[model samples]
Target: QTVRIGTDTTYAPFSSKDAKGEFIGFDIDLGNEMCKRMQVKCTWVASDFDALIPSLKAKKIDAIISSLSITDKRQQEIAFSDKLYAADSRLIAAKGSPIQPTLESLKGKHVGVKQGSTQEAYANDNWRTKGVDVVAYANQDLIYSDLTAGRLDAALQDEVAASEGFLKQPAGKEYAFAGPSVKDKKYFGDGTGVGLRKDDTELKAAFDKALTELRQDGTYDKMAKKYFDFNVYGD
Candidate 1:
């Protein structure tokens, strides 16, 4: 079986276009490995972050591996395999800024989040109308760009992503995590997972089995080490 996997190719360290313009990242590698283990070929499709699910439902793609969190609301629309890894959302601000992401702390401040993301949903549900102006961008790069331009007082995204995609980059050198890690399962769901159609039980089971094999053989850890110094397989 040749699987068509849809992903947003702009989010780095997770999925992105590499120097050679080839799609590369943790998700890309992991998904490809799953295809190999399943004895299937893979076709990578780049789509906007917000369009992934719709594309899946429309049969435009067979699966989604776009660093997409598995929230309850999303689960209602699609099924997910075991989590790829643990992840938590966090806020980023100027290194010494006193801004926390709390309602009172962020009053009158502008915060950036990726449109259609769990962070965006969390902010809209918990911060909007509480005197915090939550701004939504189509991509992580845009959010960080506005944050770096001083247009945003802070930004919210995956903690690891904030570090790899922004904080460690030249443009984000002056920013740092400013608030507690937000792991509200109510919003962020059960970490990151490979999303599939609800009815694709066989495919889901096969992928799950492959994931177990990868972890048990230490292949998962080896791949993780290639990109991160710490354990991304959260507790």
Candidate 2:
């Protein structure tokens, strides 16, 4: 059998094209690992983050292994397998910025976030109309660009994205990660997971079983550690 997965291909470290333009990274590895346990072949197709929910609803893919956050709003629309890894939302700013992560501190400051994402939703539900100018963009790269150009006072983004997208990038030297991660059960929900169509309970079970086995065999840990310095999966 074959399992087709949807992923956002340009988000580095999690899923993206390499220097030679190959879709490779954490999401790919997780897909491959799941297929290995299932004795199935895997094929991945690129889907925009905003379009993933629609794609799943249309049955365009079996599951979304695209580093999707498990938010309460998302649960109302789709069912997600148990979390594959914990993802934190961090605040990023220029090295000398005095701003902190508190909603009170960001009042009147410009903030950037990926629209339609949990991060954007968090800003809207919690910070919008509170004097903070929330700027929504389609892609994270653009968010960082606006931040670098001084259009945004700070950016709320995936911790891993902030690390690879900013801290490790050539122009990222001037920026520094600041503030603690925000996690609200009603907003950010919990960790990252493979999202499945709400009615595809069978497919969801297949992945959940494979993932549980992967954890026991230490395969999941090895795969996660290969790309990140820390163990994203914990006991």
Candidate 3:
């Protein structure tokens, strides 16, 4: 099978375009590896983060390898393979900022988040009522750009992404995590997983088995260490 993989190629260390304009990241590599192991052809398509699920439903892609979290709400629309890895959402702000991630701490503050991401949904549900302004961007790059420009007081996103993708970069040198990670099953979901159409049970099973083999062979760890210092495959 030729698997068309949908991805928002702007989330670095997970998915992003390299200097040659070729897609490169953990997700990209994992997808390619999985396809190889499964004896399928892999094709990657670029789409907005918010459009990944919709594209899958439209049959424009076979699976979503972007960092789409597995949630009950999403499960209503699509099935998910077993977790690809674990992650928690976090808030990043300028170094020494007085702001915390709580709604009260960010009252009247502008916080940036990727449009249509769990962070956006979580913030709107928890902070909007308390006077915190949530700003949504089309991609993680845009969110970081605005945050660095001081247009946003803080940025809420996947913790490993924020840490490895942005905070480790030169532009993010002065920013640090603002508070404890915001992790709730209701919001952040169980963890990151490969999004699949509900009916694609066979494909999901194949991916899960291949992933297990990859991990067992230490291939997963080898690739993971290239980007992350901590266990991205969370407990």
RMSD of each: 1.1, 1.7, 0.9
Q: Score candidate 2 by TM-score against the native.
A: 0.92
Question: Candidate 1 on 4-36: residue-level lDDT in tens?
Answer: 999988687889897888998899989988888
Candidate 1 residue pairs that clash: none
| Stretches > 4 Å off in candidate 1 | none
Tens digit per residue, CA lDDT, model 3, 56-175: 999999999999999989999999988889979999999999888887799899999898799999998889767888888999899998998999999899998999888999989999
Candidate 2 residues 58-117, lDDT tens each? 888878987798887789999999988887888999998888887788988999988778
Rank the candidate models, highest lDDT first. Answer: 3, 1, 2
TM-score of each: 0.96, 0.92, 0.98
Candidate that would win on lDDT: 3
Q: Using TM-score, rank the candidates from best to worst.
A: 3, 1, 2
Model 1's alpha-carbon lDDT is 0.89
Which has the better lDDT: candidate 2, or candidate 3? 3
Model 2 segments beyond 4 Å from truth? none
